[PDB]
């Protein structure tokens, strides 16, 4: 819903119910998204990623033996025209800075069949990390890779999540752990502490996912490839989808695309920035501040106008630090923010069991053929037989942050950091 309750707002998120409302804003969004798509497609690796997403159709559902119905379809207004679509890119949801990707159906996207993906994308806003502006093309690429995870049905169980940080701000033992897809595709220095040879962290998911992929590959090559009940377009799309295994999807991450596209990205705890980097947002004019080669005149030498939304950034901190003196008088007060990551109270490192017995044995998307995928004729409206229960009922999820207080007799670093900023123009250092 475009409007939600105040206490249901996500901390660090910008809420503007009037965004993307008028037709001019919608046309701006369309043109910006198309421009970012062209920028990504111009590079070879981005083009391979786009072709893969264009050919990674969800597996048809056998309603009857020999009778298959598509899962990826869109229904017209009066319900006589059906459209084949592996992925539809929307605007943002309630929070306009929350880029995301969601699955059409949970179980169908968890057990190898695959589903449609729906993307929440914000092309107009960017934030400055250190000395550069994060390219929105990279965020779109990250969401596209998550959509790849959804399309290949290799979504992990929701409880699978490697640890990310130790919440040292609190006085209690708690670990913030990051989801498996986010850790697998984010890249950064943290991904270097898990992608090791041999693998110190392994889970049943990394064994099951190739199993299900191979199972549905066999189902296609035995039942589907020899079946004339469906159009040859689905045959070609499934052939190209199964031509790339799950290891290739696993090795795709933002570090590889940062290297290929030459894009500067956060590299350290890049999915826990809401605790470290209180972002500031800049508006990108895709006719003025962007082109097919990213930001015009580099990501550092380009000038971006500060966005109007920075004052609307909601600031609900996970901790309030209050420096007080001997007589308990409130001297200083400051806010320490959370990161939006699930915090468990149990030590993951003291519970995990390193597998004694395991078997350990190129370009991330070398097998993809752009020319082959382009040559495939599209799926016409007259040859689409849908499956009714292909979509889970979407439910918005609201994260309810918790606020707690701390009283300190010794100043903390945030006390100094907040005391070093002022709005007065007559400053005495």
């Amino acid at each position: 819903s475009l409007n939600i309750n105040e206490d249901q707002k996500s901390d660090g998120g910008i809420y503007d119910s009037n965004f993307l409302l008028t037709n001019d804003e919608k046309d701006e969004f369309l043109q910006a998204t198309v421009k970012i798509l062209q920028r990504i497609n111009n590079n070879v690796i981005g083009a391979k990623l786009l072709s893969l997403i264009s050919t990674a159709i969800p597996f048809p559902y056998e309603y009857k033996p020999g009778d298959y119905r598509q899962t990826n379809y869109l229904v017209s207004k009066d319900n006589q025209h059906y459209y084949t679509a592996n992925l539809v890119i929307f605007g943002p949801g309630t929070n306009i800075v929350e880029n995301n990707a969601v699955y059409y159906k949970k179980e169908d996207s968890e057990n190898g069949m695959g589903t449609m993906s729906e993307i929440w994308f914000q092309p107009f806003l960017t934030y400055k990390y250190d000395q550069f502006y994060v390219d929105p093309a990279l965020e779109l690429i990250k969401c596209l890779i998550k959509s790849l995870y959804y399309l290949y049905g290799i979504k992990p169980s929701d409880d699978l999540s490697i640890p990310y940080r130790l919440r040292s701000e609190f006085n209690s033992l708690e670990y913030s752990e990051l989801d498996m897809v986010d850790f697998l595709i984010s890249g950064g220095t943290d991904y270097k502490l898990l992608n090791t040879n041999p693998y110190w962290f392994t889970d049943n998911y990394f064994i099951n996912a190739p199993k299900n992929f191979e199972k549905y590959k066999n189902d296609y090559e035995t039942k589907i490839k020899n079946n004339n009940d469906i159009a040859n377009s689905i045959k070609l799309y499934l052939e190209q989808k199964f031509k790339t295994n799950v290891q290739d999807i696993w090795e795709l991450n933002l570090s590889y695309f940062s290297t290929e596209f030459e894009i500067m990205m956060p590299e350290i705890f890049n999915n826990a920035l809401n605790h470290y980097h209180r972002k500031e947002y800049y508006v990108i004019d895709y006719f003025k501040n962007y082109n097919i080669n990213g930001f015009i005149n580099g990501q550092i030498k380009t000038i971006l106008l500060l966005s109007k939304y920075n004052k609307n950034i909601i600031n609900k901190p996970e901790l309030i630090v209050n420096l007080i003196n001997e007589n308990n008088s409130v001297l200083m007060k400051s806010n320490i923010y959370g990161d939006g990551l699930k915090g468990t109270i149990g030590n993951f490192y003291a519970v995990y069991k390193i597998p004694y017995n395991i078997g350990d044995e190129d370009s991330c998307l070398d097998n993809v053929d752009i020319k082959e995928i382009d040559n495939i004729p599209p799926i016409n409206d007259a040859d689409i037989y849908p499956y009714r229960k292909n979509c889970d009922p979407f439910t918005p999820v609201y994260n309810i942050t918790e606020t707690k207080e701390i009283n300190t007799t010794i100043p903390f670093p945030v006390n100094y950091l907040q005391a070093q900023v002022t709005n007065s123009n007559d400053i005495n250092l």
Binding site: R69, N79, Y385, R388
Partner: protein, 561 residues
């Protein structure tokens, strides 16, 4: 601004609730339904029983909207079995056409020589808004849309099961009474107009479903079905009849003016545009016996003896009634009278009666020289002429009241365009009536005498409503006061209103109505029922008493079943 028939003449209107009750009694609507939709290897079924249909708000013009509630239904969405709730329904859209059918209705007021046309749905049916929910609220919008498609397929396929006849009409039937062929439709039509309530609910009472029809072979090259919504809301009656003012004028006012002996059959020209009936050439109004004792011809200029409708009133006007009064003196008088056709409850029966409304208007114009030279002498002759028009007879009166009226008469003299003008408004007419000294009993005696002599004139009146010039001269050569002539003309005009009062030479029937209006004898006169019969003999609903009658741009009658 008012009620308009947009080219039609007769109209019969009912409420949505009345038509719904007609459908309920007739019970000619489908009950069991089995809608099936098959497409894209998917099958949807809706098998159940419908409830009683209701025609609710949403229909305008050609569009007809019906509410179809569902008693109980079973939905099979590719094996998904769902039980519909008892509040589920649909809103179907249909159209009405007067299909020709074998004759089954009887018209006791007609010769039954026409053709029976029954209103039926044309050969399609579309659904506008529906409500299909299960007992647990587990349905989806796409499921409901698919079921709506199945229902549309059913209604298109199973429209024949709705064998309900909406209305019955006799076309080109000759009336049993030849004079009232204006009450038999020739070209027919229908219309719908629905009005919502304050709480945004269908108004089964205020909404109006009408049926318009031309009569007397009137050509209508623009068949339109738009219906004014305020036609029934003002009446607050279940059924209503409506007769166009053009038919009220071109077939009734002509009879009233021609029968008044002031004009002949060849000296009357109809004028629909101005809604007025008058004389094309100079005519004679009667014989004038002034104070000089010399008989004078009362000549009316063409286009002055007017009979029209103004302010919801029958208006009778005389202008430019000029002659030589004496000693080379000429003066002009103008008169305007307002009458209203109301309904009176007499002896438990609704009798239409024409009664006086407000007071007349009088004007008098004269030359300045006559006033400045012979004011006193000519006033006697002017008084002798005028008193007839007021009292209905030329009788002398005492001079005290003469001076009492004369001071006011001289008070109201003005000079405009070099001429002396005097105007008499509504208050002065009632003042003259009170000061005249003539009791209402004497006026009733005058009315009785004029009714008898108007019956005699109607005996002299031929079938066409005119009288031969030889017989007209025989009747008019008798010396009689001009005021009594006005009274006789008014009596004849009012007697000619029997056609709008009672349905069925015409002279003897007029004499019967004269007996009814002079002795209060309606034993053989059904009253308004006969007229209502003419409105229901040809327009037979699948079955009333009429209690409302008025004119708002159209001669309108309201009744309850």
């Amino acid at each position: 601004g008012d009620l308009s028939l947009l080219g039609w003449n007769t109209e019969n209107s009912v409420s949505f609730r009345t038509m719904n009750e007609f459908i309920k009694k007739d019970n000619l609507y489908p009950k069991d339904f089995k809608a099936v939709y098959s497409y894209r290897k998917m099958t949807f079924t809706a098998t159940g029983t419908f409830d009683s249909w209701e025609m609710t708000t949403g229909a305008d013009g050609r569009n007809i909207r019906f509410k179809c509630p569902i008693k109980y239904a079973v939905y099979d969405l590719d094996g998904d079995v769902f039980n519909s709730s008892t509040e589920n329904f649909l809103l179907i859209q249909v159209d009405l056409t007067y299909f020709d059918s074998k004759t089954t209705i009887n018209d006791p007021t007609g010769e039954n020589d026409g053709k029976q046309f029954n209103l039926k749905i044309k050969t399609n049916v579309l659904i506008v808004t529906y409500n299909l929910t299960d007992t647990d609220g587990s349905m989806s919008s796409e499921d409901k849309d698919f079921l709506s498609l199945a229902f549309r397929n059913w209604f298109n396929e199973n429209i024949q099961q709705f064998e309900q006849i909406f209305a019955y009409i006799l076309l080109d039937e000759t009336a049993k009474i030849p004079e009232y062929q204006w009450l038999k439709p020739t070209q027919i039509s229908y219309g719908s107009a629905s009005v919502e309530t304050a709480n945004d609910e269908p108004d089964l009472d205020a909404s109006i479903f009408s049926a318009m029809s031309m009569v007397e072979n009137n050509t209508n090259s623009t068949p339109s079905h738009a219906v004014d919504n305020r036609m029934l809301q003002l009446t607050k009656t279940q059924a209503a009849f409506g007769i166009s003012f053009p038919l009220f004028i071109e077939h009734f006012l002509k009879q009233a003016l021609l029968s008044s002996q002031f004009i002949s059959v060849d000296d009357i020209v109809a004028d629909i545009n101005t809604l007025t009936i008058t004389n094309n050439k100079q005519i004679i109004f009667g014989k004038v016996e002034n104070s000089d004792g010399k008989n004078v011809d009362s000549s009316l200029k063409p286009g002055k003896l007017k009979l029209s409708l103004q302010n919801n009133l029958i208006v009778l006007e005389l202008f430019d009634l000029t002659w030589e009064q004496g000693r080379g003196v000429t003066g002009h008088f103008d008169f305007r009278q307002e009458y209203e056709l109301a309904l009176e409850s007499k002896s438990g029966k609704q009798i239409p009666i024409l009664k006086v409304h407000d007071e007349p208007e009088i004007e008098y114009y004269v030359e300045e020289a006559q006033w400045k030279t012979n004011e006193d002498m000519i006033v006697s002759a002017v008084v002798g002429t005028v008193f007839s028009m007021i009292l209905g007879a030329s009788m002398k009166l005492a001079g005290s009241a003469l001076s009492k009226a004369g001071k006011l008469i001289r008070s109201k003299a003005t000079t405009i365009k070099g001429r002396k003008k005097i105007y008499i408004n509504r208050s002065n007419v009632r003042q003259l009536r009170k000061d005249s000294g003539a009791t209402e009993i004497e006026l009733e005696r005058i009315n009785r005498r004029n009714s008898s002599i108007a019956a005699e004139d109607a005996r002299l009146i031929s079938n066409n409503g005119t009288t031969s010039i030889q017989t007209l001269g025989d009747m008019k050569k008798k010396p009689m006061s001009t005021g009594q002539r006005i009274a006789i003309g008014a009596k004849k005009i009012a007697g000619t209103a029997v056609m709008f009062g009672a349905v069925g030479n015409f002279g003897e029937m007029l004499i019967n109505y004269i007996n009814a209006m002079e002795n209060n004898d309606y034993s053989a006169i059904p009253g308004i029922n006969s007229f209502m019969q003419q409105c229901i003999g040809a327009m037979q609903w699948p079955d009333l008493k009429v209690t409302f009658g008025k004119l708002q741009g159209i001669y309108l009658l309201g009744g309850t079943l």
